[PDB]
C-alpha cells in the first residue's frame, strides 16, 4: 500500500521534471488493478489541490491535470464492484457458515482480520474497525496480536493519519507485552521514529532508528530505500561527531547500505565532508540532499527548510571548537558562498543564543567564545535552576 503513496506523492510537488509524474503513474496504474486503491485513489483529490486534484468525473467536475489516470470512468466503476463482491460479499458468506458450525477459535478471529483488511481497500473504515474490534477480544497470544496491530499500522501509512493510529498501536502493545522477535517490535519502533517527524521531535526520532537494522523492509508498509533515508538523515542530525565516528561512518550495514543505492547522499556526502572538515564541496551536498531526498520522501518533506537551516548551524560548531579564531575572507569566499549570504544565516543564529562566537567587521576574523571551565555551570545553572523554581511556585502560590 506504501508503493502507491510513495510514487503518487511525487505528483504533489515536482519543480524540475514532468516525466517524474508520468513514471510514478506507471506504478500506480499497476497496483490499482490487483488491489483496489479507491480510499487512497479518492484521497488523491482530497490531499493536494490545484495540480491534479481538480480532475474527477464523478463527485466534482473540473479538468486540470498532468495525469489523466486519476479520474473515475466506466471501467474503474465496474472493477470497484467486482473487488467489493469477491473480498467482502463472497468471503463473508463463507465466514457466516463457519460461525454457525463453530469451527475453531483463532481461525475465525484471523478470518475476521483478513476480511477487515479488505474493507480498508474498499474505502469503508467503519466496518474495517468493527470487524477488527470483534476479533480484538479473541486475541491473547502474539499469534492474533500481530494481525490486529497490522490493520491499525496500515492506517498510519496508507491514510497518512498520525492522530488515531499511534494511540491504538500503543494500547494493543501495552495490553500484552511480548514482542516476539525484534522485527515484529519494529512496527512499534519504526512508526515511533516516523511519528516524531510529524510533531517535530528531532533527536527523539533517531533513538530507535540508529539502533535499527538497515535491511528492514516491510514491503506494503514501507520500502527498502524509504526507510534507509529516514535513519540516515535523522541519525546524522541527532548524534554529534563524537558518536558519528564509532557508529554511523563505520558500520557493517550502513557501509553496505550506501553502496546499494545512490539516493541516500547522507552517510556518504554529508558525513565524510563533516569528518574531513571540507566545506568547499559540503555546501552543494545540502542542495542534493534537499531536492533528491527530502522532497521525494513523504515524512522528510514536512520539515523542508528545518533541515538545511539547522544542519548548517551545527556544522559551524564543529569548526568553532577546533579554532579560537578564523578568517572571514576564507569563510565568506573560499568556501563557495558570498559575504551577504553568510551574514543572513548567522544573522538569525546569534540573537537566539544557539552558539558562542565573535564576528568581526573591519578586521574580518571569526573568533570562537570558549567558556573554558565554565561549561554547563555558567548560564545553564542559573537559567535551569531558577527556571524550574518558577514552575515550582505555580502550584504553591495559587494552591488549588
Amino acid at each position: 500500500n506504501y508503493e502507491v503513496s510513495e510514487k503518487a506523492f511525487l505528483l504533489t510537488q515536482s519543480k524540475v521534471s514532468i516525466e517524474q509524474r508520468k513514471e510514478a503513474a506507471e506504478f500506480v496504474l499497476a497496483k490499482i488493478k490487483e488491489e483496489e486503491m479507491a480510499p487512497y485513489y479518492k484521497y488523491l483529490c482530497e490531499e493536494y489541490l490545484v495540480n491534479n486534484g481538480q480532475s474527477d468525473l464523478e463527485h466534482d467536475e473540473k479538468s486540470d491535470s498532468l495525469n489523466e489516470w486519476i479520474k473515475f470512468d466506466q471501467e474503474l466503476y465496474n472493477e470497484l464492484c467486482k473487488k467489493n463482491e469477491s473480498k467482502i460479499k463472497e468471503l463473508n458468506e463463507k465466514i457466516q457458515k463457519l460461525e454457525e458450525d463453530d469451527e475453531g477459535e483463532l481461525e475465525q478471529a484471523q478470518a475476521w482480520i483478513n476480511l477487515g483488511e479488505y474493507y480498508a481497500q474498499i474505502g469503508d473504515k467503519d466496518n474495517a474497525e468493527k470487524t477488527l474490534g470483534k476479533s480484538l477480544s479473541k486475541a491473547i497470544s502474539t499469534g492474533a496480536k500481530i494481525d490486529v496491530m497490522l490493520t491499525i499500522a496500515r492506517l498510519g501509512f496508507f491514510y497518512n493519519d498520525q492522530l488515531y493510529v499511534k494511540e491504538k498501536l500503543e494500547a494493543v502493545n501495552s495490553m500484552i507485552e511480548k514482542g516476539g522477535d525484534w522485527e515484529r517490535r519494529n512496527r512499534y519502533k519504526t512508526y515511533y521514529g516516523i511519528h516524531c517527524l510529524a510533531v517535530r521531535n528531532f533527536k527523539e526520532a533517531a533513538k530507535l532508528l540508529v539502533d535499527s537494522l538497515a535491511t528492514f523492509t516491510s514491503i506494503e508498509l514501507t520500502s527498502y530505500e524509504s526507510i534507509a533515508t529516514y535513519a540516515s538523515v535523522t541519525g546524522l542530525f541527532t548524534l554529534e561527531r563524537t558518536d558519528l565516528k564509532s557508529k554511523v561512518i563505520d558500520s557493517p550495514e550502513l557501509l553496505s547500505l550506501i553502496s546499494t543505492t545512490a539516493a541516500l547522499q547522507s552517510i556518504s556526502s554529508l558525513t565524510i565532508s563533516l569528518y574531513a572538515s571540507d566545506y568547499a564541496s559540503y555546501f552543494p551536498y545540502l542542495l542534493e540532499t534537499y531536492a533528491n531526498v527530502l522532497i521525494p520522501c513523504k515524512y522528510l518533506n514536512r520539515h523542508a527548510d528545518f533541515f538545511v537551516r539547522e544542519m548548517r548551524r551545527k556544522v559551524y560548531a564543529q569548526l568553532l571548537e577546533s579554532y579560537k579564531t578564523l578568517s572571514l575572507k576564507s569563510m565568506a569566499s573560499a568556501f563557495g558562498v558570498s559575504v551577504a549570504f553568510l551574514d543572513n544565516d548567522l544573522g538569525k543564529f546569534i540573537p537566539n543564543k544557539q552558539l558562542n562566537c565573535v564576528i568581526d567587521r573591519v578586521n574580518g576574523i571569526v573568533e570562537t567564545n570558549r567558556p573554558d571551565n565554565k561549561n554547563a555551570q555558567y548560564h545553564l545553572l542559573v537559567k535551569q535552576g531558577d527556571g524550574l523554581l518558577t514552575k515550582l511556585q505555580k502550584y504553591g502560590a495559587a494552591v488549588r
Binding site: 548567522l346 544573522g347 546569534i350 540573537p351 562566537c357 565573535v358 564576528i359 568581526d360 567587521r361 573591519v362 578586521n363 567564545n369 573554558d372 565554565k374 555558567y378 542559573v382 531558577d386 523554581l389 511556585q393 505555580k394 504553591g396 502560590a397 495559587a398
Partner: protein
C-alpha cells in the same frame, strides 16, 4: 435588626442577578432605584457576620453600561448617580475600621482604578496604592487575579515593568473558572505579553498559542517580527489594521513606547560583536531608519541599560561591548546576593506549611 436586614437583602441579591446582564429594567429609573435601596444603613455598624451581603462582585459590570450610551450618551459631563456613587464608595472606606475588612476593601478600589483607565488621570491613583496595600485574607481566588491585574496595568502607564512583573505572574495562575479563563485570561495574557513588549524579549508562541484564540495571536505575531527585525514600516501597518483591537484594550499607546522598543530590541538582534563599527555599516543596517539616527540612537540605548558602547567621532566608528566576562572575584558575587534574595520568597513556606 441584623436578621431583618439580612433577610430582605437575600431577596435583593436574587433580583441583582437579573439586574446583571439579564434584565436591565429601565435605563433611567433603575439606577435611581438601586441607590435608595442601599444607602439606608444596609452596611450598618458592622455588628456581626457582615460581608459578601452587599453588592460587591455584582455591580462591577453593571454601572459601566449605564454610563456609556445609556443614561449619558455624551450629553453630560459625568453621571450624577456615579458622582454620588464615588461619594458612597469613598465613604465606605473612610468609615472602615481596618479590622475584618479584607475583600470589601480591594473591590471598591477596582472602580476608581478602572475609571482612570478610560477617562481620567492615573497620576492620582499612585496615592491610593499606599492605602490599597493590605494583607487581604478574604479575597476569593476569582478576585485575586483581578486584584493583581489592575496593579500590573497601572505600573505599565508609569513606565515600570519590574514592579508589575511580580503581580502579573500570580494573575494568570489564579481564577480557574471557565469564564475567567476565556475572556479574563485572554485579556490578561495580552497584558502579560505587554510587559514583554516593554522589556524587549517578546518570546515566541508556545503556551499562548493554544491557550487563547486566534484573535490575540494575529497582532502579537506581527508585532513580534516588527520589533525583532527593527522595521518601522511593518510596525506602522500593524497599528493601522489592528487599531480596532488596540482601542478597546487601551493598548493604542504602543505607537510610542513600543515603537521606541523596535530600535532597542533590534540592537541586540543585529551583531555588534566587533569592536569598531563604522558609521556606514550602521546606516546600511536596520533599513534606512538607522542612517538618520546614528550617534544619538546609540547614546540613549547605553544609559537605558540595553548595551554598553563607546562612540568615536574622530575616525568615524563606535566601539561596542557585548557584556561578556569571566567570574573571578566580584563578578560571581553579584548574583550571590540575588540568588539568596530569590530564595527569600520561598522562605515564607515554613509558616505556610
Amino acid at each position: 435588626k441584623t436578621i431583618e436586614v439580612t433577610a430582605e437583602i437575600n431577596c435583593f441579591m436574587h433580583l441583582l442577578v437579573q439586574l446583571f446582564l439579564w434584565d436591565s429594567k429601565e435605563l433611567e429609573q433603575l439606577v435611581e432605584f438601586n441607590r435608595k435601596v442601599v444607602i439606608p444603613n444596609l452596611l450598618c455598624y458592622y455588628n456581626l457576620r457582615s460581608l459578601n451581603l452587599i453588592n460587591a462582585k455584582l455591580w462591577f459590570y453593571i454601572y459601566l453600561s449605564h454610563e456609556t450610551l445609556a443614561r449619558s450618551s455624551e450629553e453630560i459631563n459625568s453621571d450624577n448617580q456615579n458622582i454620588i456613587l464615588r461619594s458612597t464608595m469613598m465613604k465606605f472606606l473612610k468609615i472602615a475600621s481596618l479590622k475584618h475588612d479584607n475583600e470589601t476593601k480591594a473591590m471598591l478600589i477596582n472602580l476608581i482604578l478602572r475609571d482612570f483607565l478610560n477617562n481620567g488621570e492615573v497620576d492620582s491613583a499612585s496615592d491610593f496604592i499606599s492605602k490599597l496595600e493590605y494583607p487581604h485574607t478574604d479575597v476569593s481566588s476569582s478576585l485575586e487575579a483581578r486584584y493583581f491585574f489592575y496593579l500590573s496595568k497601572i505600573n505599565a502607564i508609569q513606565l515600570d515593568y519590574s514592579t508589575a512583573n511580580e503581580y502579573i505572574i500570580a494573575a494568570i495562575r489564579k481564577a480557574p473558572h471557565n469564564s475567567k479563563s476565556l475572556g479574563f485570561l485572554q485579556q490578561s495574557n495580552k497584558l502579560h505579553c505587554c510587559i514583554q513588549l516593554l522589556m524587549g524579549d517578546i518570546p515566541e508562541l508556545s503556551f499562548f498559542h493554544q491557550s487563547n484564540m486566534q484573535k490575540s495571536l494575529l497582532p502579537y505575531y506581527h508585532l513580534t517580527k516588527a520589533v525583532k527585525l527593527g522595521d518601522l514600516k511593518k510596525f506602522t501597518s500593524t497599528i493601522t489594521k489592528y487599531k480596532q483591537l488596540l482601542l478597546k484594550d487601551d493598548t493604542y499607546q504602543l505607537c510610542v513606547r513600543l515603537r521606541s522598543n523596535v530600535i532597542k530590541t533590534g540592537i541586540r538582534i543585529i551583531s555588534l560583536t566587533y569592536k569598531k563599527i563604522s558609521l556606514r555599516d550602521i546606516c546600511l543596517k536596520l533599513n534606512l531608519d538607522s542612517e538618520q539616527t546614528v550617534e544619538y540612537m546609540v547614546s540613549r540605548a547605553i544609559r537605558d541599560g540595553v548595551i554598553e558602547a563607546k562612540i568615536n567621532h574622530e575616525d568615524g566608528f563606535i566601539e561596542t561591548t557585548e557584556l561578556l566576562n569571566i567570574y573571578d572575584s566580584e563578578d560571581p558575587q553579584q548574583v550571590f546576593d540575588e540568588r539568596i534574595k530569590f530564595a527569600n520568597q520561598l522562605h515564607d513556606e515554613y509558616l505556610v506549611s
